[PDB]
Design an enzyme around this catalytic site. Structure first.
Site, PDB file in Angstrom:
ATOM      1  N   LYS A  42       0.811  -1.244   0.000  1.00 14.59           N
ATOM      2  CA  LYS A  42       0.000   0.000   0.000  1.00 14.59           C
ATOM      3  C   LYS A  42       0.835   1.281   0.000  1.00 14.59           C
ATOM      4  O   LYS A  42       0.325   2.364  -0.288  1.00 14.59           O
ATOM      5  CB  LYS A  42      -0.996   0.051   1.169  1.00 14.59           C
ATOM      6  CG  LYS A  42      -2.022  -1.094   1.212  1.00 14.59           C
ATOM      7  CD  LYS A  42      -2.954  -1.098   0.017  1.00 14.59           C
ATOM      8  CE  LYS A  42      -4.328  -1.671   0.404  1.00 14.59           C
ATOM      9  NZ  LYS A  42      -4.262  -3.018   1.082  1.00 14.59           N
ATOM     10  N   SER A 272      -2.417 -12.601   4.302  1.00 14.76           N
ATOM     11  CA  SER A 272      -2.866 -12.559   2.916  1.00 14.76           C
ATOM     12  C   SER A 272      -1.781 -13.052   1.970  1.00 14.76           C
ATOM     13  O   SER A 272      -2.084 -13.496   0.867  1.00 14.76           O
ATOM     14  CB  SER A 272      -3.326 -11.149   2.515  1.00 14.76           C
ATOM     15  OG  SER A 272      -2.222 -10.282   2.280  1.00 14.76           O
TER      16      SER A 272
END
Lengths: 311, 8, 311, 8
Positions: A42, A272
């Site tokens: 991110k 994840s």
């Protein structure tokens, strides 16, 4: 020569590592996005969303960043806001992992905690409420729809994969949160470099809204533990048109897989990342993928998950 | 757990 | 092309970022060694100590790594042992920060906790005790004296600094733990690239054994909070001959400085990174250093310090 | 605190 004017410019150039205990004869390679400022993929959109908003004139000195996020995007925007001298307010349920409240507080973020039972929607409501109080003062960057999200992946993440594999990449496997990663990477490789790879979106079996949507079935989101993916809706920044396949993975297996990455590969990845690898391993063990090079995005690092269920 | 954009 | 055969090979190539709120007109630039597998500069020596021991024949399949370390070197050796398929035992006082016991346990490390009141010496005693039980089975890598420590910095860290500054680096500021970083970097730049820079070692004012030694004064180590430096002795891997200057920094200022890096620069660095920057800032604000480019090693990232005193 | 190689 290579000195970044601030930390936002140091994004990317993350490495590819071949896995030894997954895949078949080294066909599975991972891209370690934990090697980033703020320790996640991110950081790329945190930077580019701010950069674009500056170029657009929507973000200027004086104006304040306001947004809702209970994940890595908040940490990314926080470090970018700090690096470039913006004030920032982040809204999120009062159900955060303290360390994250401190990390964010340490980064200078104005934390506005909302009621937990409201979850994200509570928080987004408060964000938009705060923006309404003086739209001239507050800019919301909107990671789920802001095209600067997938664009940065098209300009950096995708080209890094192409360059580091010498164009030999055949498959990209990526978990979907905002969809920005898989979207940009796919656009880069298929459209800019012209190679017809297989783009694989990954989502939790607990909340398989992409799979249900594409099958024309009833969309039934659900709770899961794979932090970073499974938003429970189809985000605007997921370009379904470039998705070739969707793989579902369960939370326990995603977790078990992240633990194996640490213990067996010496790779410190988040939950994840285990999900993305479990999906990739499945494909890598089909004979149709045996001579194909599979690149898997590992979105974050595992120390961001001490005291979750990973440890 | 995570629902409706939570944890992203 | 650029795919690492395992995670140990992905070391280095860490970025340089110019500071905005320290130094004078951008003369202070930081090298972010937190951008590494296992999140610290020690990933470099973890890798190279193992690689060298393999090349030497002292480390082979079957043989087990045994060593004492309560810092980042354990995490580095752990991820390398996991990546390359070695068993590893690490000894350390029973006064570890649980998360580190779990991180290490998660990495597959055989944790042997010793009595705390003994501290490191207790732990090293147990390490050597365990090695004694079957010297044919156990290899101790000895970070404080193993020349493969500074060598990796001479071959990678130093050359990265040279290349990224286009040879314009004038000063290197680095905290001293094993001394490997400052030693290798200095040897690279002064001896291999032939530039007469100023090498600045940094140590805690609480335990200024390098300063006391060089002054011919009584050596009086002491306790401090700057994790990673101030070993309380002069390590074999500190080459005093290449040290031009020694700067002392106190724990509170090191801490305050790390907090400023986060809040003001959006840089997530550890306590010892704050120490190195505080020392560099002092030099950078002397007129003798005004037109000099100062490169500061930031050894680690701050999430390894949630629940210390940093947060 | 850290003493005699502790924390390295």
């Amino acid at each position: 020569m290579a000195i970044y004017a601030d930390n936002s410019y140091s994004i990317g150039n993350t490495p590819l590592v071949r896995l030894k205990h997954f895949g078949h004869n080294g066909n599975v390679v991972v891209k370690i996005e934990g090697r980033n400022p703020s320790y996640s993929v991110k950081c790329r959109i945190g930077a580019n969303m701010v950069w674009q908003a500056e170029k657009d004139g929507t973000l200027t000195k004086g104006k304040e960043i306001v947004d809702a996020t209970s994940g890595n995007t908040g940490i990314a925007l926080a470090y970018v806001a700090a690096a470039r001298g913006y004030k920032i307010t982040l809204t999120m349920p009062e159900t955060m992992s303290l360390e994250r409240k401190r990390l964010l507080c340490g980064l200078g973020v104005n934390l506005v905690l909302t009621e937990g039972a409201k979850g994200m929607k509570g928080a987004i409501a408060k964000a938009e409420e705060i923006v309404a109080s003086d739209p001239s003062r507050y800019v919301m960057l909107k990671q789920f729809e802001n095209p600067a999200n997938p664009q940065i992946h098209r300009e950096t993440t995708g080209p890094e994969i192409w360059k580091d594999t010498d164009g030999k990449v055949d498959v990209v496997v990526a978990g979907v949160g905002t969809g920005g990663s898989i979207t940009g990477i796919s656009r880069a490789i298929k459209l800019d470099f012209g190679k017809q790879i297989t783009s694989v979106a990954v989502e939790p079996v607990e909340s398989p809204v992409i799979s249900q949507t594409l099958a024309g079935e009833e969309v039934k989101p659900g709770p899961h533990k794979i932090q970073g993916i499974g938003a429970g809706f189809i985000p605007k920044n997921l370009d379904l048109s470039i998705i070739d396949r969707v793989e579902t993975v369960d939370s326990d297996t995603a977790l078990a897989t992240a633990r194996r990455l640490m213990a067996e590969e010496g790779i410190l990845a988040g939950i994840s990342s285990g999900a993305a690898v479990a999906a990739a391993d499945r494909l890598a063990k089909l004979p149709e993928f045996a001579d194909k090079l599979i690149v898997v995005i590992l979105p974050s690092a595992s120390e961001r998950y001490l005291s979750t269920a990973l440890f | 757990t995570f629902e409706y954009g939570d944890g992203i």
